[PDB]
Ligand binder design. Structure first.
Ligand SMILES: [Zn+2]
Length: 238
């Protein structure tokens, strides 16, 4: 449930704080683009994926990024956002089974094997991201990746950072942290999109750019409370 997700995020962050390793807690951010959504069913057809692993101390530690060719409204959503070419001329990995395995391999290298995997994405994108993972599938069907709210993470993380920094502020609430996240202050950073999206100037809607911007947003919102040396590329734009 969403209530459950929220309590779980709070517990994750508090585990880190209590171990005195909040700055080293690692979080994986994910972003999907989709070509279109089935009219009657919860089926989003994936077009692009990125993931990154982030900690306050190290900033971006790794990034995984790929265009997706699923083979096949589609025109409108796609043309106004990512504008990736539609099937049968779509770019990217066309082996969906291989893609999913490669994504899980990446998440497992980050989080460990034999564990439920946890990733974060904007609240308004959770349904879509789960649907895209399902499209890519399964032993997973019969039975894996929990998709949590990155904005709730930002909120809880900011409050616990401020507690640690002896900076508690009753006036900082989730309206404020949501506002900061949605400002997208690093939208116009050069060189963080994939090559296609640099070519077609739709970097705003590039998954690789998006997970990088979210990382820079976390750093800008919190690393100042913590006396962490920010690193070019990793914490802030190169
Ligand atoms: Zn892209």
């Amino acid at each position: 449930s969403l209530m459950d997700m929220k309590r779980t995020i709070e517990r994750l962050v508090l585990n880190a704080k209590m171990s005195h390793d909040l700055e080293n807690a690692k979080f994986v951010f994910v972003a999907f683009n989709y070509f279109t959504k089935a009219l009657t069913t919860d089926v989003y057809v994936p077009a692009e994926f990125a993931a990154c692993e982030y900690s306050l101390k190290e900033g971006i530690r790794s990034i995984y990024s790929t265009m997706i060719d699923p083979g096949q409204d589609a025109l409108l959503h796609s043309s106004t956002t990512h504008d990736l070419p539609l099937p049968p001329n779509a770019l990217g990995e066309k082996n969906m089974t291989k893609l999913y395995r490669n994504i899980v391999d990446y998440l497992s290298k980050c989080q460990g094997k034999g564990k439920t995997l946890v990733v974060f994405t904007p609240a308004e994108n959770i349904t879509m991201v789960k649907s895209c993972f399902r499209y890519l599938e399964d032993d997973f069907r019969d039975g894996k990746i929990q998709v949590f709210d990155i904005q709730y993470l930002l909120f809880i993380l900011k409050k616990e950072v401020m507690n640690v920094a002896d900076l508690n502020d009753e006036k900082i609430n989730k309206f404020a942290t949501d506002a900061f996240f949605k400002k997208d202050f690093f939208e116009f950073t050069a060189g963080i999109a994939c090559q296609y999206h640099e070519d077609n100037d739709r970097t705003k809607y590039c998954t690789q750019s998006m997970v990088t911007r979210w990382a820079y947003t976390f750093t800008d919102f919190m690393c100042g409370d913590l006396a962490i040396t920010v690193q070019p590329g990793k914490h802030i734009p190169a």
